[PDB]
RNA sequence: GCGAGCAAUGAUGAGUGAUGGGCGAACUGAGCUCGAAAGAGCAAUGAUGAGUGAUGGGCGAACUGAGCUCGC
């Protein structure tokens, strides 16, 4: 049982997510120091430039982007998604730099729970 | 104060602006959805709002063309 250790992040979204999240904070430990209320928005790019700069309207999601639930679903759904998203990325990134102790399953189930309430509510 | 020089065969005005890429001034911060309705489930370990692309109606918008210069 001692051969089956892992991260976290490589099996809630896997490398083409947590890498980018990775390098649009900079590191990992920067990553694990950020809200999800920026984990969001991280590598939205032009469009969190704008919303400061000239004001513009608020990123609703960054390199998220292209989430199995986002990309491929209705309006309704794309917004509520990307937060809550950003919430169980908040946490896996923290317990992946602090401890680096495997959770991930029960990260994953909280987000099947959490979508399948997006879809008895929308 | 009055005259003098230049000018439609071109007087006047302006040291200031363009195009492209990030960061900073504490994102919102609790509601939502189902139900006859009390109720129930989800939520600060993040509810909700803030997307991109396209379709239709409406609203508004800016070089001049003669003045410039002076001696006592």
Do not use: C
């Not at 700069?53 to 209705?74: C, F, L, M």
């Not at 908040?90 to 994953?108: C, N, P, Q, T």
């Amino acid at each position: 049982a001692m051969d089956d250790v892992a991260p976290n992040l490589k099996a809630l979204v896997g490398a083409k997510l947590a890498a980018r999240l990775i390098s649009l904070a900079g590191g990992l430990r920067e990553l694990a120091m950020m809200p999800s209320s920026t984990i969001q928005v991280l590598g939205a790019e032009k469009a969190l430039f704008r919303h400061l700069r000239t004001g513009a309207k608020p990123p609703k999601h960054g390199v998220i982007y292209q989430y199995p639930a986002i990309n491929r679903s209705p309006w309704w759904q794309r917004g509520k998604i990307a937060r809550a998203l950003a919430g169980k990325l908040a946490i896996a990134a923290r317990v992946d730099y602090f401890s680096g102790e495997y959770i991930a399953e029960e990260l994953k189930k909280e987000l099947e729970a959490r979508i399948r309430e997006i879809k008895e509510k929308y």
